[PDB]
Design an enzyme around this catalytic site. Structure first.
Site, PDB file in Angstrom:
ATOM      1  N   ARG A 148      12.399  39.714  59.865  1.00 31.02           N
ATOM      2  CA  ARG A 148      13.271  40.789  60.337  1.00 31.02           C
ATOM      3  C   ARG A 148      14.659  40.750  59.696  1.00 31.02           C
ATOM      4  NH1 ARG A 148      13.388  43.921  65.858  1.00 31.02           N
ATOM      5  NH2 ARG A 148      11.489  42.707  66.258  1.00 31.02           N
TER       6      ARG A 148
ATOM      7  N   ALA B 164      10.687  36.780  63.477  1.00 31.45           N
ATOM      8  CA  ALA B 164      11.258  35.516  63.006  1.00 31.45           C
ATOM      9  C   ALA B 164      11.035  35.303  61.517  1.00 31.45           C
ATOM     10  CB  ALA B 164      10.660  34.357  63.798  1.00 31.45           C
ATOM     11  N   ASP B 165       9.846  35.649  61.030  1.00 32.98           N
ATOM     12  CA  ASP B 165       9.533  35.543  59.608  1.00 32.98           C
ATOM     13  C   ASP B 165      10.328  36.520  58.746  1.00 32.98           C
ATOM     14  OD1 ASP B 165       7.793  33.479  60.099  1.00 32.98           O
ATOM     15  OD2 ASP B 165       6.014  34.765  60.256  1.00 32.98           O
TER      16      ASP B 165
ATOM     17  N   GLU C 151      -0.547  44.247  69.073  1.00 35.46           N
ATOM     18  CA  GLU C 151      -0.290  45.380  68.176  1.00 35.46           C
ATOM     19  C   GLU C 151      -1.417  45.586  67.177  1.00 35.46           C
ATOM     20  OE1 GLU C 151       3.412  44.678  66.203  1.00 35.46           O
ATOM     21  OE2 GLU C 151       4.663  45.419  67.845  1.00 35.46           O
TER      22      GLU C 151
END
Length: 166
Positions: free
Chosen positions: A15, A12-13, A76
């Site tokens: 991509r 969202a930030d 991750e």
């Protein structure tokens, strides 16, 4: 190994914008970069993803304001940091519109996103995420705020990334 770069990022930030330019610059310099579709992801990372993190010589952590809002991103990060101790794996940090102190101490809006994510989560898992975030901020990296030309900054990322894999 099976990839050069595993990118860890919150879609969202970045991509649509910043990550898209990084990927364009990486393919231009022939940097083999793992890609994963936004829709597919399950509740946990699961085995396929972990093998890709294991299989990458470099992990690039793209830290952004709402990166802590994703349990998937935090999972991750923990796998990347475990890979750093156990495998040779190199970790690079891009601080994209966030200060490392907020990453290090879980403070500010990044901390607020982290606090909401940890509601409902095992204590051991929360400590693993918190420790990984604290470790990750000590890794010296690139700061979007301190570069006048974002395109120039990305070109430096690619140059450094290519230098570490050749």
């Amino acid at each position: 190994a099976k990839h050069d770069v595993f990118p860890s990022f919150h879609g969202a930030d970045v991509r649509r914008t910043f990550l898209s330019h990084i990927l364009e610059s990486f393919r231009r310099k022939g940097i083999d970069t793992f890609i994963d579709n936004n829709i597919e992801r399950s509740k946990s990372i699961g085995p396929e993803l972990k093998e890709a993190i294991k299989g990458s010589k470099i992990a690039i952590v793209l830290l952004s304001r709402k990166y802590a809002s994703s349990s998937w991103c935090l999972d991750e990060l923990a796998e990347i940091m475990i890979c750093r101790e156990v495998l040779g794996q190199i970790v690079m940090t891009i601080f994209y519109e966030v200060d490392p102190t907020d990453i290090k101490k879980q403070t500010g809006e990044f901390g607020k996103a982290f606090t909401k994510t940890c509601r409902g989560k095992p204590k051991e898992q929360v400590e693993r995420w918190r420790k990984a975030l604290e470790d990750v901020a000590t890794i010296a990296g690139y700061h979007s705020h301190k570069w006048c030309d974002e395109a120039e900054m990305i070109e430096k990322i690619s140059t450094d990334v290519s230098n570490m894999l050749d």
